[PDB]
Amino acid sequence: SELAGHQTSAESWGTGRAVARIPRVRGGGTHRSGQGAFGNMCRGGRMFAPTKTWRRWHRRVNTTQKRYAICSALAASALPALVMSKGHRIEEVPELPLVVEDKVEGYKKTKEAVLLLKKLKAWNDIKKVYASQRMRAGKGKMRNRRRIQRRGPCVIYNEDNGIVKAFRNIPGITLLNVTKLNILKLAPGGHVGRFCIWTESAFRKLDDLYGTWRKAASLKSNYNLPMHKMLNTDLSRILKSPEIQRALRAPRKKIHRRVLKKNPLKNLRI
Amino acid sequence: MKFNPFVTSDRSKNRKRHFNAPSHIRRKIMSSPLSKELRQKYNVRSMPIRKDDEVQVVRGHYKGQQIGKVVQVYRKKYVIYIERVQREKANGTTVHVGIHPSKVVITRLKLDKDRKKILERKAKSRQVGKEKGK
RNA sequence: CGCGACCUCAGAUCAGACGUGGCGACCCGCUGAAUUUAAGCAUAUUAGUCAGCGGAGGAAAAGAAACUAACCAGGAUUCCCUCAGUAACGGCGAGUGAACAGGGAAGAGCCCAGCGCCGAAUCCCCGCCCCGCGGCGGGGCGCGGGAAAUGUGGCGUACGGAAGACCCACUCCCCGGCGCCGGGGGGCCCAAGUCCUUCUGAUCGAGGCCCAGCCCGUGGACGGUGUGAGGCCGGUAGCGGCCCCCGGCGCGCCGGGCCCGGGUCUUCCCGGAGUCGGGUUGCUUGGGAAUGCAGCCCAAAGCGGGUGGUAAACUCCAUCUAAGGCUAAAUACCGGCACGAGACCGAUAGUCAACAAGUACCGUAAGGGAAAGUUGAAAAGAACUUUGAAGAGAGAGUUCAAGAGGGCGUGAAACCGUUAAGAGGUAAACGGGUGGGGUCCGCGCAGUCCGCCCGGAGGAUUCAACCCGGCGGCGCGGUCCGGCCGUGCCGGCGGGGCGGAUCUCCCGCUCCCGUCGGCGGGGGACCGCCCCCCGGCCGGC
RNA sequence: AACACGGACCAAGGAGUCUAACACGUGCGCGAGUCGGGGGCUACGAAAGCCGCCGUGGCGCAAUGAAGGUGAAGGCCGGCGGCGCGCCGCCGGCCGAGGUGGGAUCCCGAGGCCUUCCAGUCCGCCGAGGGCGCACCACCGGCCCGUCUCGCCCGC
RNA sequence: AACCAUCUAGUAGCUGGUUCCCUCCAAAGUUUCCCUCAGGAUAGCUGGCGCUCUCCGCAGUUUUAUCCGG
RNA sequence: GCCGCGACGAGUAGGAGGGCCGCUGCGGUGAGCCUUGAAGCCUAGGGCGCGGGCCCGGGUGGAGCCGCCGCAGGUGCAGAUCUUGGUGGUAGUAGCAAAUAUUCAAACGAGAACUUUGAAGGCCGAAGUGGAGAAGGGUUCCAUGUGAACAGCAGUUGAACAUGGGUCAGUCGGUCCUGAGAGAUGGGCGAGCGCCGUUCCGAAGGGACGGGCGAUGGCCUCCGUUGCCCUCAGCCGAUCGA
RNA sequence: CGACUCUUAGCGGUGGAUCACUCGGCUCGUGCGUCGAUGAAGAACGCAGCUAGCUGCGAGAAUUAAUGUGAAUUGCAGGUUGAUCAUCGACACUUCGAACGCACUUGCGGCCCCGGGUUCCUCCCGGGGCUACGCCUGUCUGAGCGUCGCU
Numbered sequence A: 001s002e003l004a005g006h007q008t009s010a011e012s013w014g015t016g017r018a019v020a021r022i023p024r025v026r027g028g029g030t031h032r033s034g035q036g037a038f039g040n041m042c043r044g045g046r047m048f049a050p051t052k053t054w055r056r057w058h059r060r061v062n063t064t065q066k067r068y069a070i071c072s073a074l075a076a077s078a079l080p081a082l083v084m085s086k087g088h089r090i091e092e093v094p095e096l097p098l099v100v101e102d103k104v105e106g107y108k109k110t111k112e113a114v115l116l117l118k119k120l121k122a123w124n125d126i127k128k129v130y131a132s133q134r135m136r137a138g139k140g141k142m143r144n145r146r147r148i149q150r151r152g153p154c155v156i157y158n159e160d161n162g163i164v165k166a167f168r169n170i171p172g173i174t175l176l177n178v179t180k181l182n183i184l185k186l187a188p189g190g191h192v193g194r195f196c197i198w199t200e201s202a203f204r205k206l207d208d209l210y211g212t213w214r215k216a217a218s219l220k221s222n223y224n225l226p227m228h229k230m231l232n233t234d235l236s237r238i239l240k241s242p243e244i245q246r247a248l249r250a251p252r253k254k255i256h257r258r259v260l261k262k263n264p265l266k267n268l269r270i
Numbered sequence B: 001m002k003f004n005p006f007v008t009s010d011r012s013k014n015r016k017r018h019f020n021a022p023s024h025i026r027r028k029i030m031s032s033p034l035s036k037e038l039r040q041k042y043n044v045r046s047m048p049i050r051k052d053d054e055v056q057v058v059r060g061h062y063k064g065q066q067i068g069k070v071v072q073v074y075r076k077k078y079v080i081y082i083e084r085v086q087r088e089k090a091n092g093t094t095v096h097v098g099i100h101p102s103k104v105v106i107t108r109l110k111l112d113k114d115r116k117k118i119l120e121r122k123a124k125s126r127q128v129g130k131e132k133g134k
Numbered sequence C: 001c002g003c004g005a006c007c008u009c010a011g012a013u014c015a016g017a018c019g020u021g022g023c024g025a026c027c028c029g030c031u032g033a034a035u036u037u038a039a040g041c042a043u044a045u046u047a048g049u050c051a052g053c054g055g056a057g058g059a060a061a062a063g064a065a066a067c068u069a070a071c072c073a074g075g076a077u078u079c080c081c082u083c084a085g086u087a088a089c090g091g092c093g094a095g096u097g098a099a100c101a102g103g104g105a106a107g108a109g110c111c112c113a114g115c116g117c118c119g120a121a122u123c124c125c126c127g128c129c130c131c132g133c134g135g136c137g138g139g140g141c142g143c144g145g146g147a148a149a150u151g152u153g154g155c156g157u158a159c160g161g162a163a164g165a166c167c168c169a170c171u172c173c174c175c176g177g178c179g180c181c182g183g184g185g186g187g188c189c190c191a192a193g194u195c196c197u198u199c200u201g202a203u204c205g206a207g208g209c210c211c212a213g214c215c216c217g218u219g220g221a222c223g224g225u226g227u228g229a230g231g232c233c234g235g236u237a238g239c240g241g242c243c244c245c246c247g248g249c250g251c252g253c254c255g256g257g258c259c260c261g262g263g264u265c266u267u268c269c270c271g272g273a274g275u276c277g278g279g280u281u282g283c284u285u286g287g288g289a290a291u292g293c294a295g296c297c298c299a300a301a302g303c304g305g306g307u308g309g310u311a312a313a314c315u316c317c318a319u320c321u322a323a324g325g326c327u328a329a330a331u332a333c334c335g336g337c338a339c340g341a342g343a344c345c346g347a348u349a350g351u352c353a354a355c356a357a358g359u360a361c362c363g364u365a366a367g368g369g370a371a372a373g374u375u376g377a378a379a380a381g382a383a384c385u386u387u388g389a390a391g392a393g394a395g396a397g398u399u400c401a402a403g404a405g406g407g408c409g410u411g412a413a414a415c416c417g418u419u420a421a422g423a424g425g426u427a428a429a430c431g432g433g434u435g436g437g438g439u440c441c442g443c444g445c446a447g448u449c450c451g452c453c454c455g456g457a458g459g460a461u462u463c464a465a466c467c468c469g470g471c472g473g474c475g476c477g478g479u480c481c482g483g484c485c486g487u488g489c490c491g492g493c494g495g496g497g498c499g500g501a502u503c504u505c506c507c508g509c510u511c512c513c514g515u516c517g518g519c520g521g522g523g524g525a526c527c528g529c530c531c532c533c534c535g536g537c538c539g540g541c
Numbered sequence D: 001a002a003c004a005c006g007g008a009c010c011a012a013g014g015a016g017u018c019u020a021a022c023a024c025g026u027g028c029g030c031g032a033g034u035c036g037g038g039g040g041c042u043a044c045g046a047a048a049g050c051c052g053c054c055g056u057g058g059c060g061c062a063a064u065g066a067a068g069g070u071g072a073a074g075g076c077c078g079g080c081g082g083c084g085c086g087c088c089g090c091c092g093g094c095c096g097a098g099g100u101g102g103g104a105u106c107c108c109g110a111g112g113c114c115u116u117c118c119a120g121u122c123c124g125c126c127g128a129g130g131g132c133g134c135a136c137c138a139c140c141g142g143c144c145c146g147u148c149u150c151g152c153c154c155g156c
Numbered sequence E: 001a002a003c004c005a006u007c008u009a010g011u012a013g014c015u016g017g018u019u020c021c022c023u024c025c026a027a028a029g030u031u032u033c034c035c036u037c038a039g040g041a042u043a044g045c046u047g048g049c050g051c052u053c054u055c056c057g058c059a060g061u062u063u064u065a066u067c068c069g070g
Numbered sequence F: 001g002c003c004g005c006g007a008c009g010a011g012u013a014g015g016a017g018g019g020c021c022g023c024u025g026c027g028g029u030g031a032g033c034c035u036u037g038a039a040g041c042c043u044a045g046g047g048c049g050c051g052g053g054c055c056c057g058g059g060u061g062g063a064g065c066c067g068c069c070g071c072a073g074g075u076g077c078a079g080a081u082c083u084u085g086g087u088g089g090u091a092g093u094a095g096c097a098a099a100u101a102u103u104c105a106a107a108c109g110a111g112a113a114c115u116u117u118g119a120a121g122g123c124c125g126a127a128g129u130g131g132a133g134a135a136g137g138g139u140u141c142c143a144u145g146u147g148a149a150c151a152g153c154a155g156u157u158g159a160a161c162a163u164g165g166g167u168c169a170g171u172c173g174g175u176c177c178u179g180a181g182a183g184a185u186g187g188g189c190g191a192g193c194g195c196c197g198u199u200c201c202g203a204a205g206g207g208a209c210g211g212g213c214g215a216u217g218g219c220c221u222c223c224g225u226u227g228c229c230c231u232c233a234g235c236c237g238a239u240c241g242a
Numbered sequence G: 001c002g003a004c005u006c007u008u009a010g011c012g013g014u015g016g017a018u019c020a021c022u023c024g025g026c027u028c029g030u031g032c033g034u035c036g037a038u039g040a041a042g043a044a045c046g047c048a049g050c051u052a053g054c055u056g057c058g059a060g061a062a063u064u065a066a067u068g069u070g071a072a073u074u075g076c077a078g079g080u081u082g083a084u085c086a087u088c089g090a091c092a093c094u095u096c097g098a099a100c101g102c103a104c105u106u107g108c109g110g111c112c113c114c115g116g117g118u119u120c121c122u123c124c125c126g127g128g129g130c131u132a133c134g135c136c137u138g139u140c141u142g143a144g145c146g147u148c149g150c151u
């Protein structure tokens, strides 16, 4: 608040009296007399630049960049190294863009959905989360941000047939509609590689939502896929082609170190 | 997760509720479990505790198998004074030590009119909830 | 003179009614400053702002055109975006500063006087009787009493309207009650281990529960509990359950009121003065030969009047009908009640105040206005003995611990006591360079292994080569068999899904004389693009 | 160092921040376009996603002039009408969007880069000399609006 | 020209103070205008960011010619 | 990223770069640590870094904490005659000097220069260091007990502390009166909360005795108790103010 | 070696920093959006077995009734045909305050009705109920060489 601090009346004593020339409290036999009200340095007193509400909290962003991002993130979900480097445990899992039959939607109980994840052998990630459930450090503690845990594997569905109610109890697992995707969840910390579990409807719909490079997306008004700058990333294979090696000079790679100056007047053979 | 938006999940508001709770709510707070034998009989998990109930303390210094009788309830400190759990202060006078109700198990109910009434209400809601869930 | 009608004005402790103050975050109407800026200051600016006074509501105010425009025209108010830092104002300096059109939220329109018709067809109160009565009403009856011609009610109000006659077609609405069927407030309830081992003062910890990978999960938010708990308790989830009150839409019936319309042709009717407007003064506004408001003085009209952003005379055009009134929705809210959250603050911070705070205390008074949190799991708060007047202590004693003993968690520096060590006449204190002594450490105090070789001494059911079985890697198998794909390419008696400012008979609709055009829609061709099928080329895995 | 000022000692607190606008530099997206920020549809989320017959509107794609206004190459052959062989204007055909100098990179390539001595092709590499010239700079011409001077004609 | 609160954190070309390391570069007190002389602007001095070319151009210098100077 | 070659290195006001320098909090991440003892704090221990600072050992303590990639900030103190809080030297010093004065024995009591009694010596010297009141203070009055704190030495004492008690009116005062004056009503002014003004532009009496008539209540005798009519009435300005 | 002075470490003292705890704030948002002559807001004075304050309450004075709940409160004594808590519709709410009988002394009154007082003599005493200003509609009684009518 703006009021904070300044509610006092305080005339200065001024010159003389061998004192600081400060706003001092107006009389009264009690501790607070000559005791110092305003000024960031005085006890009590107005802190510098009272925090205003009309600070610029919100930052808007462009649409094209948002969609670029969702694409890059999805591309990364196919790469396993990236998925591992985000720490997700996935070695016996058969295929990374892990597609599933459309009967799960009909599931309505956690005992079944768990037994399913057991059959797919994805439970070790949850096991890691269970072992990792522990306490937060700091004052947060007293503001309802007490416990922290690792993020788990995403599940994407097209239509809700009870599955949402059925999975929400498992710690970590975020569900998602496909039409209404989110970045803040897909790439936490702006770090690439959340482990996802697709359903066949959602897997087929991506071709219509974003399109290929020779067919635009039918749903969004005007949006084709983002173009490559260079296709052959693997320059290692390039650099040892016949053609370039053919057209290069010889590598002068011998090291010629510093020679010591010996005196010709003294040394005969020099 | 709680989805009801008018219920609060805030530390200081719940602590305030407990430490400044009224007698009639404290009654409801200070509840204890039934043994599995009695659970077989009434088909009831838990009951509010009464002045004249027999009990076994599970944890603490005084734990054991000694079925002690309750003497008196002190709701203002959320605690009860039981027959043999005590210690002698120097001068000689003995003092019953307070125990928290959850660390206690019932072996024989003092069965009034209302107590049987309540157990049947709880059994009714159990039969309905299981057949309804079914 | 006396008596009686009215008129005007008093008194009543007359019978019955209403106002009077508070709160004042948001709203409305007045009055109304200076600090300050201009590098000075005086007009401007600060500013129609703080401060003063009055009056309200859950919202207020506003509002159905004396309008905008000047286009092929729009059509109450309120609010958002944009028009815009524009046109304009100003010691032309400093600075100030709108509106209309456009896209949106919401969207609802109405009423008197007058002019005129109708036996005043109107109203209030008393009294008597019936029903109902915790929002004081419905009905019937009185040579019961007043109001009202200085005008009560019905119709009807500028979008025109009435009366009269002539044609056509009509039957459900309003007021309150009763019972019977289907949001809000209050109350009580609902899953699953204290299972087996282990540390510890106390366990919510650790480890374990096998192929039914402990049990429940539509419930793993949170709090409590002698540390850290999905499963110990309260709660949380669930179109889960039960019990009360109030409302909400429906249905069946009683006692009353209202008896209204659609067109046609003929005849009549129609508007609100100390107000507009002008001169003049002073303030205010972006409004400049005066945008608005007010005071004085003057003082009008009826094919009239106002407005049409440079005064005026003449002139044609356009557009509205002032001077009487009402009106819900969207919008605003740092006060209040009752609620929810947070990348906020953590006892010199945060409201001045986490506590018996607007308290103690100060000033004659208006007003000013503080300091101040924390034993422990459990009061277990130190019985008993002993010196001393007692305070104070000594033994013993609780507790895991008093190395926590009632301003008691942890307990730094400044400052002091004592102990230990070292030293001492140029105040102390310092950098560089060395020495001596202390201090503890090195777990020092007979000191490197590593490959390979050479040699001498042990021992194990052991090396190579082949056979069998499995697997991986590679293949100029020059060119083994079959797939899959291509931001590769040709053919189509293809089937299509989109788009097209390329074309195209029928259909539907209005008008004219079964006939002739137009508009809208729809097939119907035509161009491009992709998807699924074949066939064939090029290249990859 | 000062006969210039402040300072006995210690702990904790204590000072270029936020908002608007502008200017320049850098990073990112799309590109003669670009932006939905207002509005509408659809536990964490008061988020996120969508809207294009919601691109009205904003900025940019054209300036100049006080204002009414106006608005960004030209050259050549024959003809026709007219005048002093040539010219002006008016009809048909061809080239058609400047020039000079300096210019990083590219192109041409006389000749040639060694096995036994000659004969003998293909692939590279170097290079005398000569060209097309990006960006950018300098200069010269041309076009547009206002303004001044001198002129002669076309049009209904 | 009293006292209390509010406008009010009122203005200051004037005193005073302004919180971690290293590395690299490194100044001026002069011109003109100002009711300007304890102050600003403005040129000058300084840094940083780069960019176009280089592996013909420039210099606080001399020489040779040639003018100027009071 | 690693590596090789040469040349150079002062720096105030000022600018720029890198900081595995450091603080507080947010999303990810370490199958991170911890009651077999976290944070903080102390240290003549061992060490690292040019430095900002950091890591190990030991002691104390008893419940939460940190590393790495990104984000945001109320983010680093010696000074400001800075703010609040605490502590030194100066110092066991300056000082406890206004108006003549004390002395002997005895008692309670642990203890006595100051308590009490007695005895002796002095002073205030009725314009009083006396006895009684007002305004004003507000339980301080009285008794019993206490000996922490206060009474600038002490105290067995006290106006300190703790327990309890206590103020009796027809005649003593206020209450009644008016005094200088304040202040309503009517009236006027005033945008207005409100203001002027106090007899000035006001219909400013609710009273009495008898007569008549009416109306009740009583040993209705005689006298009350209400009403009308006749007849009569100067005030002065409501009201407070010793 | 002494005492005194300086420096460092161990230990004890003064003082209460740091760290860890948090029934309080700030900010944003939602839904409602209600006082009073039927005596409000504010202030004063009182009330508990042991009670000063804080908190609650009005001569029924830390609470009555009714309804829900279903056996305690507690620092100490003592006393289930509903103790105790909550909910709150009935019941009640002292004295100042716009403040209302006139004054602020807490002083004076005035009218009517009951009971003691009489022996209706009315006194005396207690209690109860009325007694603010402005304004409206009606009721009643009046005023005026205002305007008339009859006489």
Ligand SMILES: [Mg+2]
Pocket: A138
């Ligand atoms: Mg911390």
Ligand SMILES: [Mg+2]
Pocket: none
């Ligand atoms: Mg009356």
Ligand SMILES: [Mg+2]
Pocket: C022, C023
């Ligand atoms: Mg109010």
Ligand SMILES: [Mg+2]
Pocket: C037, C038
């Ligand atoms: Mg000025």
Ligand SMILES: [Mg+2]
Pocket: C039
């Ligand atoms: Mg100035």
Ligand SMILES: [Mg+2]
Pocket: C040, C041
């Ligand atoms: Mg001046």
Ligand SMILES: [Mg+2]
Pocket: C047
């Ligand atoms: Mg003004």
Ligand SMILES: [Mg+2]
Pocket: none
């Ligand atoms: Mg203005």
Ligand SMILES: [Mg+2]
Pocket: none
């Ligand atoms: Mg109201």
Ligand SMILES: [Mg+2]
Pocket: C061
């Ligand atoms: Mg209104």
Ligand SMILES: [Mg+2]
Pocket: C062
């Ligand atoms: Mg209005």
Ligand SMILES: [Mg+2]
Pocket: none
């Ligand atoms: Mg109107």
Ligand SMILES: [Mg+2]
Pocket: C068, C100
């Ligand atoms: Mg307009």
Ligand SMILES: [Mg+2]
Pocket: C110, C111
């Ligand atoms: Mg109307």
Ligand SMILES: [Mg+2]
Pocket: none
């Ligand atoms: Mg009407």
Ligand SMILES: [Mg+2]
Pocket: C113
């Ligand atoms: Mg009328």
